[model samples]
Target: KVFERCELARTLKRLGMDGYRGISLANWMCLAKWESGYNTRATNYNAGDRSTDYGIFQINSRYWCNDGKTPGAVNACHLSCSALLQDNIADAVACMKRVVRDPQGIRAWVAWRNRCQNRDVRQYVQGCGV
Candidate 1:
């Protein structure tokens, strides 16, 4: 329920986001489920696979996590990631929000949905409107 509330708030904010103005809360919830399963502890492991950077909104692994360490390499983690991992949630969510507000939509949450996934239709269906 805690995560659900945060997800709802983010969904509402995305309504005014460019390139996805008012996409809808359901879609946003679908996205959150895809990106991290509402689990802030999740981190991408595969460097070769481009789908791993799926943090928060699947913010490209490069932008917010260890890049060069991952794919479509662009940027890198800006702060203490190890520390953040130990104590995540709010900080990581804020990081996602920051990336989303970027001009490139740097993480491009919607695009992440096109890729990185568990390949389980049930999960995806159950995930929608999360």
Candidate 2:
């Protein structure tokens, strides 16, 4: 599913992303915009580490989900990488909460740091009624 910007904002808010771990909804919007363009099935394979990023937030096989192929990988989320590709996003959101519990917080996603961090991110959810 490729969600419209406003739709995604509202959905994320409903998933309790608005102020998760001190990260605003706009920041989450910005992360999704750059990470997967709101596409639920988005994926990126990392040749360097032989791992893959899955879903809207680009959760990695190396540290988050299990793909059964990433060497030395840990399934911290205790879910298959395939779960992150679903349209529902409920599983993805649940895993994301676990990710934020770490010291890195929202910085778990590099795209958020490069694109959303310390930037004017409110525009992502400005008219979303989220």
Candidate 3:
């Protein structure tokens, strides 16, 4: 048996339980959707091209995860994505959560969401429920 989409809700919750309570399951899942379409082991054809970006967080493997010169984001970031290797989920989310906790960052998140207020599935920012 394979997997189904509806199960993602519970999966997200279980995957991100690091006792930190930073980004909520919903928003985190939203990011997963935007980043890897929730597909674990997802990789772009050109990992180095800016068009490919990075992992679930899209952190730009060349700059953030890779050694700059040798830029195969797969090997560089393979263990860094909840979409591929979920063990890093809590740590990544916790750190990003801390950054977004800044007051200015919160405002920026709001602004970003507002900028995309019309989109259907591009929910990248936390809502009131978060």
lDDT for each candidate structure: 0.48, 0.93, 0.42
Residue 79's C-alpha lDDT in candidate 3? 33
- Position 96, candidate 3: lDDT: 45
List the candidates' TM-scores in order: 0.47, 0.97, 0.42
Per-residue lDDT of model 1, residues 18-127, tens digit only: 23433344455556666666655566665456545443444555556554445455444464444235323454555655665666443365544574333333333243
Best by lDDT: 2
Counted clashes in each candidate structure:
2, 0, 1
Candidate 1, pairs of clashing residues: 53-61, 54-58
Q: lDDT score of model 2?
A: 0.93
C-alpha RMSD values across all candidates: 6.9, 0.8, 7.2
- Cα lDDT tens digits for candidate 3, 1-130: 1123345545445555222344345555555565556554455645346434434444334423442433443433333333333433444444345545555442333422543334443243334222
Model 2 CA RMSD to the hidden true structure, in angstroms:
0.8
Query: Which is the better candidate, 2 or 3, if ranked by TM-score?
Result: 2
